């Protein structure tokens, strides 16, 4: 059941039996279409990432000690990567209930892309993968932080530290909790911080868009010129594939649904992209 049984006194329902109607499923936002996507055909991708760059000691002499403009990068190698999930289904339940099959391909396709996007934005890399938005980025100086409320001012302030790095600013990758909290505060008198009451169907600061995702850990917002920073090469696009006449699916009384994409991710420089923690 799912709540008190009022009249049904059959608990069998003919080894499962259900009528054609909507099956509930998850939809989440993503930090994946924020980053630019382009296809690639090859066996690996090679990137350069910037190591420490010595600006050295500023001019004070000529041909005694000279300052250095020298910037250094190292090459790193990226293998082709697989994101995949399999779902195992039995034909009899599926056939009688009726929408299950269709539900299962869409729910599976969504599920994997959603889980990838979640992992990809936040936190430091693993040993099977490279480039994650959170790793790539730098902090921000004490100046951005304030002791007077003005949500708009913090985000504004952050853009200027980012400009020195030479970010042209694509989109701002923002957190659902922080943004809400910014609304809950007041501008003293009337209005709401960040953007005011009347506009909330479109939220834009600096003449720039907001893609709102919870992928990133709470209390963090990330402005950046997202298109430069990372690039997601795709070797093969997303498809559902089903094997049931192949060897192991055959053995079962069942059909196997595979949902995959063959993916990569490059992270250019470690001094592009900027994180800030909001106090509002």
């Amino acid at each position: 059941m799912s709540q008190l049984s009022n009249q049904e006194k059959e608990y069998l329902i003919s080894k499962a039996l259900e009528t054609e109607e909507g099956r509930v499923a998850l939809a989440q936002a993503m930090a994946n279409p924020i980053r630019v996507s382009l296809d690639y055909q090859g066996v690996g991708r090679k990137l350069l990432v910037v190591d420490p760059l010595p600006q050295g000691a500023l001019p004070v002499y000529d041909k005694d000690v000279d300052a250095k403009a020298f910037v250094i990068s190292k090459r790193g190698q990226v293998p082709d990567q697989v994101i995949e999930g399999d779902r195992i289904q039995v034909p009899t339940f599926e056939i009688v209930s009726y929408p299950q099959v269709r539900f299962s391909q869409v729910k599976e396709r969504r599920f994997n892309v959603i889980d990838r996007a979640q992992q990809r934005a936040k936190a430091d890399i693993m040993a099977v993968e490279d480039a994650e938005i959170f790793s790539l980025l730098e902090g921000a100086a004490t100046a951005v932080n304030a002791v007077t409320i003005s949500s708009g001012g913090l985000q504004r302030a952050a853009l200027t530290k980012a400009f020195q790095e030479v970010e042209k600013h694509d989109l701002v990758v923002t957190k659902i909790v922080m943004n809400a909290s910014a609304f809950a505060d007041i501008r003293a008198w009337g209005q709401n911080e960040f953007d005011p009451v009347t506009q909330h169907e479109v939220l834009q600061t600096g003449l720039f868009g907001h893609i709102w995702t919870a992928d990133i850990l709470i209390s963090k917002k990330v402005p950046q010129n997202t298109v430069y920073v990372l690039a997601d090469p795709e070797f093969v696009g997303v498809m559902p594939i089903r094997q049931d006449i192949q060897v192991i699916p055959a053995d079962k009384p069942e059909e196997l649904r595979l949902g995959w994409v063959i993916y990569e991710e490059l992270g250019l420089a470690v001094v592009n992209s900027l994180a800030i923690a909001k106090i509002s």
Binding site: M1, Q3, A16
Partner: protein, 150 residues
């Protein structure tokens, strides 16, 4: 216990799974119990309960046995400690629950023996007492529900 609300009306009112304290032998790796669907926000008895054997989901969730028929798996080495309260619909731990037993008492309904199939509804049922068998020591026949020992 609750085969006295049961006999084909299973999963209504409070049911525990236990009549006596579980045997030894801890299970290692903690995990949550929930019988809900994207959270337990079920409060109070009746509705879906976490009575029955269990199955591991993502190995981070345990929940009631609600699979498909055919390729069914009999006995299991533990049942979840009761969190059955009126702030819940059956067992569902809002902390991590760690289990134990050599196997213990479970609840069986239907015209089988102690072993049925699953129709994706809590616990097991199904007919055929000659194509099914007792779990635990000595022959026990089912007529209105009984607590069968794994």
């Amino acid at each position: 216990p609750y085969v006295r609300l049961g006999y084909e009306g299973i999963l209504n009112g409070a049911h525990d799974i236990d009549v006596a304290g579980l045997n030894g032998v801890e299970q290692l790796a903690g995990k949550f119990a929930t019988i809900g669907a994207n959270g337990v926000k079920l409060a109070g008895d009746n509705g879906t309960n976490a009575v029955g054997l269990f199955r591991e989901d993502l190995g981070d969730m345990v929940n009631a046995s609600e699979k498909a028929s055919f390729y069914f798996r009999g006995g299991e080495y533990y049942v979840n400690i009761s969190r059955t309260s009126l702030t819940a619909a059956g067992i569902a731990a809002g902390d991590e629950i760690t289990c134990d037993a050599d196997g213990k008492m479970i609840k069986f309904t239907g015209t089988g023996k102690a072993l049925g199939v699953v129709t994706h509804v809590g616990e097991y049922r199904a007919g055929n007492m000659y194509e099914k068998a007792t779990q635990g020591v000595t022959d026990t026949d089912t007529f209105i529900g009984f607590i069968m020992y794994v």
